[PDB]
């Protein structure tokens, strides 16, 4: 609903990866400082600079 590039990235952010957890839930993992997280980093965003 409401197709727009307001808050959409697609294949996760840069340096990140979608890995499947032992429970089945796909968590996020960054490759910049080797640090994963349960929450969604690509979702927590609503502002930028241009």
């Amino acid at each position: 609903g409401s197709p727009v590039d307001s808050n959409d990235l697609g294949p996760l952010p840069p340096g990140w990866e979608e890995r499947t957890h032992t429970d089945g839930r796909v968590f996020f993992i960054n490759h910049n400082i080797k640090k994963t997280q349960w929450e969604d980093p690509r979702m927590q965003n609503v502002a930028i600079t241009g």
Binding site: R19, T22, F27, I29, K34, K35, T36, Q37, W38
Partner: peptide, 17 residues
Amino acid sequence: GSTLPIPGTPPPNYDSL
């Protein structure tokens, strides 16, 4: 006897992956 669904610690570290 699990019960606890979310312990608190993040997923598997990249170093361990």
